[PDB]
């Protein structure tokens, strides 16, 4: 089975650990971004996200937030666990980066989108 | 005044959600209770986890949520702000992704679907 | 069948004008948007698209680019032409604004995603 | 150096496509031949329409097309933008919108996909 247990790398030279997962789904981790949208410093964030055990699938979705310290943003991932075609783990997900705005007026322009494929470390 | 999480919502599409208390690392659990789904499954509460962003302990904060159902194999996250809209009443304005399951790495391209929904206090 | 010809204005108080939709779906318009995530002056954009034929739907689905005049950047818009309950014409779309960055690196931050419904103006 | 959208492209699914000059006001017709699709149908070559946006005449513009298949009822919409990447290679990073149609405006919420493609020179 792929199994979210672990230290991971993506695309984007980001990587994150996420501990053991639970018999309801349920992890932690952290996250430390190589990117940020802002000019702010970054640093290492928590997550927080639960995977899908019904059928108990080898290859499971999942998804989760994490919870940004250095900006008021919040990204969430979501995604398949996968075994490639060489027996490696990959992790398929895409993203949705939610910025703070002022007013709800500029609440239309708060969020972006985009993957990231994440393999061991 | 300030947006706050904690309670029972509904949205524009006829689901409900309770969320629990906000603990001072911006945690909180729930349960969401879904009127749409895109399989032919019976709908079933299903748990919720997820942050809200503390920093600069903003009124309005962002958040983010995972919705880990129970009735099907697919997971949904929701991220947004808790707004004070003009009339001052909270409303939770979110996008979400729906990500299914998939057998095969090569369908990966076509398992995920978008969109948005808007949360009021029930 | 609702169709994409004429005045349309969105929940965020943007107006269109799409004419003629022609017998292999395209169509042409004019956007002037009421938001922006620049700080430019906005003005009014040309708009071309497409309505899908497949079997003559009375609620086709259909996709446009509004090629933004005022800015570097490019929003798409695919939804479906529905019949409400009340027998009115609403467009439920999505839309993708890319912005322009100066290095690929950036790529990542240049998606926001969104929702607009549009009615008849 | 310029990105040109011009010519034709190779995507990571496998799917290619032709894009045809690019007039004065930024349009541009092309051919897409896709590799995979969501339904059971066959593919067949579609048409495609966009622009590239020539606002300050970026060597790296932005850009979007509507792709309106022809072997399904649903249409496909990219934004992206034409780079030279640090190789010297043009490539076109872009992200889509994939809406489905449905037959009850009540299942409009499931109806968008959301991904990613990325082109190189065929």
Redesign the interface.
């Known amino acids: 089975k792929c199994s979210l247990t672990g230290k991971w790398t993506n695309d ?1 030279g980001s990587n994150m650990t996420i501990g053991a997962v639970n018999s ?3 992890f932690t981790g952290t996250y430390i971004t190589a ?1 940020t ?1 802002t000019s702010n410093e970054i640093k290492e964030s ?1 997550l ?8 108990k ?1 080898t ?22 666990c ?1 075994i ?2 060489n027996g490696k783990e ?1 992790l ?1 997900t ?9 007013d ?12 990231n494929i994440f393999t061991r470390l």
Chains 1, 3 share one sequence.
């Open positions: 984007l309801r789904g349920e990117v949208a928590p927080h996200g639960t995977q899908n055990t019904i059928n699938r290859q499971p979705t999942f998804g989760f937030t994490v919870n940004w310290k250095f900006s008021e943003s919040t990204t969430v991932f979501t995604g398949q996968f490639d075609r990959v398929k895409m993203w949705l980066l939610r910025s703070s705005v002022n709800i007026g500029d609440d239309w322009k708060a969020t972006r989108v985009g993957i």
